[PDB]
Amino acid sequence: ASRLLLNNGAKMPILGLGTWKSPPGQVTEAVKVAIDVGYRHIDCAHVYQNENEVGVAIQEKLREQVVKREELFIVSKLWCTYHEKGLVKGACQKTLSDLKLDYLDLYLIHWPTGFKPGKEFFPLDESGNVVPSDTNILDTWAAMEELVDEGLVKAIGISNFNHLQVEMILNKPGLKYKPAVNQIECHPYLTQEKLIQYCQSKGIVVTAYSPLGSPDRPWAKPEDPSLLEDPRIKAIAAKHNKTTAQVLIRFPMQRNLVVIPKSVTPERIAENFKVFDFELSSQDMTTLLSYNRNWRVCALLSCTSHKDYPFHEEF
Ligand SMILES: NC(=O)c1ccc[n+]([C@@H]2O[C@H](COP(=O)([O-])OP(=O)(O)OC[C@H]3O[C@@H](n4cnc5c(N)ncnc54)[C@H](OP(=O)(O)O)[C@@H]3O)[C@@H](O)[C@H]2O)c1
Ligand SMILES: O=C(O)Cc1ccccc1O
């Protein structure tokens, strides 16, 4: 069941189900199976274009008395086109209506980069590059703070923020709510030891996304590395009578991180849950950390020139 304590007093399930790339015609079933198997944490976002169909699953399990609403921990994220002051509440309410809830447990700023408002998720000019908003991180944070005061979200957080951008929020004049969570990419090829040590020293919980290396990302190449097929990680799995996927989900848990693997496959959803009944040794852990290559799945390469692009700093 286990769970980590956030700085608002709530408890967050250390395992959750991810839904980026989960088709609208498969995800309702995937979330229904997850909840049956014992998942109590769903990771969502407006930009995934499937929050209505995730919502259908959640409502069905609530009607069925499988879970009560307080048992679930539902996360969504504010997309970059909604960073302006007067648009943050509207974006939150559209996500709440699609999911058919009256509050979210955790709401994140998806990326620190603000885009020009519009229907397009990545708005372009006549030259073909992304158009930025003139908004900043601190104003967007003040808008996220008033959602807490209004009762729409219980906790607020951030995603893909480097340590200097988190610093900016922690040092903000009149800061009312600290970020509860920083959701970042993390796996054996991108171990993030400095950003994790920094967040954990300030009482911010880390969530690890793309824990299996995201083999189904639409920009995948044949000569890219594959975590699931790494012989060295295959060896560690075989020693424990577990799968490679189970080892990759266990690894962040023993670093005190929340982990959110995605699957629409009922047998893999079940497999990803059976991770609470074994331990990686400190030797296994230190070996898995040594596999760091500084390789990113999610690099937001179209915004490399944005004033708030997060990945120019070391951590
Ligand atoms: N904050 C952000 O900016 C951000 C960015 C990226 C990701 N995330 C979140 O983190 C979640 C997880 O990361 P991700 O979706 O990039 O990738 P992932 O969880 O690392 O991997 C998903 C892929 O692995 C496959 N898989 C799942 N279980 C497996 C198993 N036991 N054996 C073999 N293959 C397995 C899935 O296939 P099937 O589905 O076909 O089973 C799918 O192809 C996302 O869905 C999203 O919720 C957030
Ligand atoms: O940031 C994420 O969660 C992954 C994602 C989803 C849709 C478009 C771009 C993109 O990087």
From Swiss-Prot:
Pfam families: Aldo_ket_red. Cys-298 may regulate the kinetic and inhibition properties of the enzyme, but does not participate in catalysis. Tolrestat inhibits retinal reduction. The keyword Lipid metabolism applies. The record marks 77 as: Lowers pKa of active site Tyr. It catalyses: an alditol + NADP(+) = an aldose + NADPH + H(+); all-trans-retinol + NADP(+) = all-trans-retinal + NADPH + H(+); 9-cis-retinol + NADP(+) = 9-cis-retinal + NADPH + H(+); 13-cis-retinol + NADP(+) = 13-cis-retinal + NADPH + H(+). Substrate binds at residue 110. GO terms for cellular component: cytosol; extracellular exosome; extracellular space; mitochondrion; nucleoplasm. It is found in: Cytoplasm. Keywords: Acetylation, Cytoplasm, Lipid metabolism, NADP, Oxidoreductase, Phosphoprotein. Its EC number is 1.1.1.21, 1.1.1.300, 1.1.1.372, 1.1.1.54. Signal peptide: none annotated. Changing residue 77 to M: Reduced glyceraldehyde oxidoreductase activity. The modification N6-acetyllysine is found at residues 94, 221, 262. Highly expressed in embryonic epithelial cells (EUE) in response to osmotic stress. Coiled coil: none annotated. The modification N-acetylalanine is found at residue 1. Monomer. Belongs to the aldo/keto reductase family. Catalyzes the NADPH-dependent reduction of a wide variety of carbonyl-containing compounds to their corresponding alcohols. Displays enzymatic activity towards endogenous metabolites such as aromatic and aliphatic aldehydes, ketones, monosacharides, bile acids and xenobiotics substrates. Key enzyme in the polyol pathway, catalyzes reduction of glucose to sorbitol during hyperglycemia. Reduces steroids and their derivatives and prostaglandins. Displays low enzymatic activity toward all-trans-retinal, 9-cis-retinal, and 13-cis-retinal. This is Aldo-keto reductase family 1 member B1. It comes from Homo sapiens (Human). The gene is AKR1B1.
